[PDB]
Design a protein around this motif. Sequence first.
Motif, short mmCIF file in Angstrom:
data_model
loop_
_atom_site.label_atom_id
_atom_site.label_comp_id
_atom_site.label_asym_id
_atom_site.label_seq_id
_atom_site.Cartn_x
_atom_site.Cartn_y
_atom_site.Cartn_z
N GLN A 90 0.80 -1.23 0.00
CA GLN A 90 0.00 0.00 0.00
C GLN A 90 0.84 1.28 0.00
N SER A 91 0.28 2.33 -0.61
CA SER A 91 0.85 3.66 -0.78
C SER A 91 -0.06 4.70 -0.07
CB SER A 91 1.00 3.98 -2.27
OG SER A 91 1.52 5.27 -2.52
N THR A 92 0.09 4.82 1.26
CA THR A 92 -0.68 5.77 2.10
C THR A 92 -0.22 7.20 1.78
OG1 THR A 92 -1.06 4.16 3.86
CG2 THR A 92 -1.03 6.47 4.54
N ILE A 93 -1.17 8.17 1.79
CA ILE A 93 -0.82 9.57 1.55
C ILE A 93 0.25 10.01 2.53
CG2 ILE A 93 -2.78 10.50 2.98
CD1 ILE A 93 -3.10 12.61 0.52
N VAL A 94 1.22 10.81 2.07
CA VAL A 94 2.29 11.28 2.94
C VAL A 94 1.84 12.59 3.61
CG1 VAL A 94 4.72 12.03 2.94
CG2 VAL A 94 3.98 10.16 1.42
N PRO A 95 1.74 12.64 4.94
CA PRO A 95 1.38 13.89 5.61
C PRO A 95 2.62 14.72 5.89
CG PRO A 95 1.33 12.09 7.22
CD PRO A 95 1.89 11.52 5.91
N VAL A 96 2.55 16.03 5.62
CA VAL A 96 3.70 16.88 5.82
C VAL A 96 3.29 18.12 6.62
CG1 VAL A 96 5.54 18.15 4.66
CG2 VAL A 96 4.69 16.04 3.63
N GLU A 97 3.92 18.33 7.76
CA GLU A 97 3.72 19.54 8.54
C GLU A 97 4.83 20.46 8.10
OE1 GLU A 97 4.77 20.41 12.99
OE2 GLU A 97 2.78 19.47 12.84
N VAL B 136 10.20 18.51 0.56
CA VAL B 136 9.61 17.32 1.16
C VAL B 136 8.35 16.93 0.38
CG1 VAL B 136 8.55 16.43 3.25
CG2 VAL B 136 10.53 17.99 3.42
N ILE B 137 7.49 17.94 0.02
CA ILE B 137 6.33 17.64 -0.79
C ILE B 137 6.83 17.15 -2.16
CG2 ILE B 137 4.35 18.67 -1.99
CD1 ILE B 137 4.45 20.99 0.21
N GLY B 138 7.83 17.87 -2.72
CA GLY B 138 8.32 17.56 -4.06
C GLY B 138 8.88 16.15 -4.18
N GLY B 139 9.69 15.73 -3.20
CA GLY B 139 10.30 14.39 -3.32
C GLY B 139 9.26 13.29 -3.32
N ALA B 140 8.29 13.40 -2.40
CA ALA B 140 7.27 12.35 -2.30
C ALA B 140 6.38 12.34 -3.55
CB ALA B 140 6.43 12.58 -1.05
N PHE B 141 5.94 13.53 -4.00
CA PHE B 141 5.07 13.60 -5.16
C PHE B 141 5.79 13.13 -6.44
CE2 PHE B 141 3.40 16.07 -8.76
CZ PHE B 141 2.09 15.64 -8.74
N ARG B 142 7.08 13.51 -6.57
CA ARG B 142 7.89 13.12 -7.72
C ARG B 142 8.01 11.61 -7.79
NH1 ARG B 142 13.66 15.87 -7.77
NH2 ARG B 142 13.92 14.43 -5.99
N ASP B 143 8.07 10.94 -6.63
CA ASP B 143 8.17 9.47 -6.63
C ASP B 143 6.80 8.79 -6.85
OD1 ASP B 143 10.94 9.31 -6.44
OD2 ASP B 143 11.00 8.71 -4.32
N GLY B 144 5.75 9.55 -6.88
CA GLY B 144 4.43 9.00 -7.17
C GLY B 144 3.49 8.87 -6.01
N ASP B 145 3.82 9.54 -4.90
CA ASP B 145 2.94 9.50 -3.74
C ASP B 145 2.05 10.72 -3.69
OD1 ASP B 145 4.33 7.26 -2.83
OD2 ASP B 145 5.63 8.44 -1.49
N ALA B 146 0.83 10.53 -3.21
CA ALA B 146 -0.01 11.69 -2.90
C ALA B 146 0.56 12.28 -1.61
CB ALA B 146 -1.44 11.24 -2.68
N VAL B 147 0.42 13.62 -1.44
CA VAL B 147 0.93 14.31 -0.25
C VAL B 147 -0.18 15.20 0.24
CG1 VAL B 147 2.75 15.86 0.66
CG2 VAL B 147 3.28 14.37 -1.31
#
Lengths: 72, 72
Positions: free
Chosen positions: B2-9, B18-29
Amino acid sequence: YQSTIVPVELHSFEDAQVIGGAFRDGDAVVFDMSLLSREEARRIVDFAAGLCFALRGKMQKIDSVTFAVVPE
Amino acid sequence: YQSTIVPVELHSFEDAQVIGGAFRDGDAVVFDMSLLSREEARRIVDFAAGLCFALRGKMQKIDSVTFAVVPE
């Protein structure tokens, strides 16, 4: 076939999509922000930094009103 | 797997990566801008719009201080 840098004279933040489309397709873009407000120029540079991050490109400041985005 | 959304404070505009790295790899943030200044929150949203444009993703406003970026 040659790939000349795409020059873009910006008119509003809506023109971020003009830089985005060309850069997304793999073209370098050089853009002019001298007709923008201070607020909109900042917005464009931040949007362009997001483009570069996403596609592993590089943003270069030429002068206070001219920047370029270059694909990986 | 599973690919759970990445939460970022977020703490500063530097956390755009931090948003960019996760989204670039294909994760929702999903990111929280409630600890940012008004200036920095605007910068983050513009950078995130550039990420979404580059990778054909979608940005969604959840509330005044919470947005999500979702891959294509």
